[PDB]
Amino acid sequence: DEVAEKCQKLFLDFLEEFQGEIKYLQLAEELIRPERNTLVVSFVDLEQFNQQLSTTIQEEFYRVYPYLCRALKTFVKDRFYVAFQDLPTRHKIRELTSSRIGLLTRISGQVVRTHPVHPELVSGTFLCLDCQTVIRDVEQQFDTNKSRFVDFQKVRIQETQAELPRGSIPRSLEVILRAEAVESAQAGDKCDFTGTLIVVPYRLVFLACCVAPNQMTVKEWEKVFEMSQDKNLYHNLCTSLFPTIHGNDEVKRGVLLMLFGGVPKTTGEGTSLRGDINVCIVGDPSTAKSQFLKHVEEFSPRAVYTSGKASSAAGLTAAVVRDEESHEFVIEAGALMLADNGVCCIDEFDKMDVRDQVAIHEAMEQQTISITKAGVKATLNARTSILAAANPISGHYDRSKSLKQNINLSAPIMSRFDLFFILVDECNEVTDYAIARRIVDLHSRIEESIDRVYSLDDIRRYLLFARQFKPKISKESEDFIVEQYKHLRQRSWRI
């Protein structure tokens, strides 16, 4: 292939002339290190240096990759594998078709299963048993001492929830990792893999090379700065986050606070203190019990929604299922572990059986879930914030009975919610007028009846910027908290 040799020469040119310091000289020198055998090359540098080479590599990656490896070996020997990063285009798993075979693309998914590291024989030195002829450098079409082996890892990935179209089963894909890409991915993580779609006998498999998990523009940064100095920022955010909901602003403040969340702390004894907030809303019907769940689900991309009775114990935390091909037992993820570092919303929490809530118990407080079933022993992180919605017994708050008799929930469950709001409906003419006018205005004037102080994207950016700070507690705050807790505890839902 003449074009392959041209690509090799052009890659040598890029390695030898890219710059006032050549970025890749130190990387090539470190490639001499035995633990380092893959080179990471930015795609943007390749495309800016020249465009014909960039297009050729993006189009015939499988065709020229061994020539790229040969170029790397030649460049290093003058004084090994090639990895690429920062491809500007993201693609969906449902987009993977046969027309894209051999193209350098990066795919986003979630790792669900992992397999141990295996040696893969690349070039084998074969000894003939008839004439004792040694055949060296035999490539494999998919003497151990003199042959070459490369570390291998197999990964099974699943479609992301956001990209999943309604009513569709999330397809799974097999990913092959080699050399430094081995063991760089962990089960339950979301990753973008850069590589190609190869043809296995047929079968569809992705060969990957890399994994994925101050510089902001001036105007966005200045908008964030300006809105950070607002004196009425709290109320403005509360109003903008729920423009169509009338009253009940305490619930708005609570959900905003749990969106912000606290800081987790780990003691010297290794014990982890939960830095999250769990919220329970219980109320008579016709209130806004659900709408908050939908708003927080649509706003936060890391939100998961679920119903009460339709969810089983296995579906919430995790399940143990036997794998068909491996003839062993593996773990299928539940909703809680998929909602990691996010928010999980449960509707009609009362209808859930006690057998399910007792399973929730561990993830509620210890923030982790442990499984000891059928010879499978594991612990998994469940760092989630739970928002639960429910109604009182018989659907109506009966004032003829005590407050405790009006909630059919266990004592620890009542204890483990930070905020517990109870909503009571009353017949007032002014409230009726306000509710009716708001509803009819929304029904008639859909868009012109919305006044948002800040954009939803702006709120998201501000929240992302704010969540990384870790404030310190002052001594004045310390003794104020001490005295406030004194007064509060000196007076069902025990404190």
Binding site: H118, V358, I371, T372, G375
Partner: protein, 572 residues
Amino acid sequence: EWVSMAGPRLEIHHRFKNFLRTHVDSHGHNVFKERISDMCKENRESLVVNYEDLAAREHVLAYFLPEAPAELLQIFDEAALEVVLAMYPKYDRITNHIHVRISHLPLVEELRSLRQLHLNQLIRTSGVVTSCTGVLPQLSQNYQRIRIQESPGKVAAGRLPRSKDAILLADLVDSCKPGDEIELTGIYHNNYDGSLNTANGFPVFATVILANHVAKKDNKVAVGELTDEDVKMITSLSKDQQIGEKIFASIAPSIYGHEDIKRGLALALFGGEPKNPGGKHKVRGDINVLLCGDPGTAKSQFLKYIEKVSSRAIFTTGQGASAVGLTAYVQRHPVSREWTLEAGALVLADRGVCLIDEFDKMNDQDRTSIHEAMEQQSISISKAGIVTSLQARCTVIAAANPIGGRYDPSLTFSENVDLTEPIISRFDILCVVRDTVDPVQDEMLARFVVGSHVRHHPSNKNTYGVEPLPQEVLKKYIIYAKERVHPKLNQMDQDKVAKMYSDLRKESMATTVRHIESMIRMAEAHARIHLRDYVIEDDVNMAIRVMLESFIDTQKFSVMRSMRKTFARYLS
């Protein structure tokens, strides 16, 4: 390749013969002649040679052994065989082949650390045995195939335990049992398997270790690894008159108050001395602790701290623990399809500690299997035509919440907890924790909690009045006390305990032998705390005090006042 040369090969063989017939220990004794005489007396088929002495004497042999294991080991086996024939010509009649075993390899590697570079090299590894096959004959020999998983204590949280295959020949056959922690020195070879190649779609070699030496990982190795500075620090701590106070205060610094619970848990952790009087009945030397608590008392925090401290620890939850999961079960192997035993949580908890959370959620059917392991510390599995016995010497700490979420002081302890009487009887220490509204105690709790919160910020990163010990120092003290002390009860006044037990019978029928046994092993553990070869009666007094406190804590309010009045002599 260079070793395969005939000249150097033969010369090294004779040099190894001279090493066998010439080495002198520090005491002037030719050790290998005593070893070979012992082997001849025992009619064994293997010889054990220390790698350290060989490295000290012949550096070239120590360099060659990890690099060319199979050929050099075969040559050494031949040399040992001919040395035996020259020394004991008749020994050919009892054995035809003798194998050389290499022990104490300096390089120890983990199952996770196995790569391509270690292929066909002698490696030392550590782990726990999970399943084993039977003795299989070969048309060459004895065969054993075993499956080894990583030790659960060494495995970090959130990551599955990996498993490997191991092969034992002749003498090494049946030298280990499932659930036994062992270290191995063996060759990391690769095997050709076409099924893996077809499944994965590319050439894959299943790496299987051929072990040369097997050594069960008793705590003797841990004792050997101890630095003499650790021993001197432990001894200096032992002479302190307030060693007990600081030891108790060193547990759960982040939790305020609750002296009795930490006292009982430490006393159970140090453990008693298991005994086998006559080999007819076995008296357990283990303490089973039950913790019944009102919500909000940080029971899970105590369990987590115990999980972290213990060298060997397994954590289980109530809902996720089935009867099959906790115990070993029989399964058909997916490849070879012979019946195999997979160890449960308790089996892997042997010599370690097992924690049960929300024990009140246990199904009664799952509860039934527990009593056998609790009473006898051994499990007999009779399934699918296979009857086996496995060791279950473990210390069990169980947590529980009263029915209804609140402990009623007007009822008996049996009524408040949904557990049968035998289960409670198997437990040695019972601790109930209640919630009281005390303003001064509330102030203390709030102040301590906020102080701990301030201390342990990542940016920033007692009742007895004694300074807590460092965690590493406490762990080293625990290990040394577990592995050195064996107290003797030669100075106990039987009349006092007999009268106390008669009073206990009177006041229990007004409202057993295993209670006496629990108190005895409690006194033994308290003596072990002070590193005393003989038990002083102060240990007995403290054990009586804490046992009486635990007993009165389980009674109704209308009678505990009378019990305290009657037993004010001992509680004071």
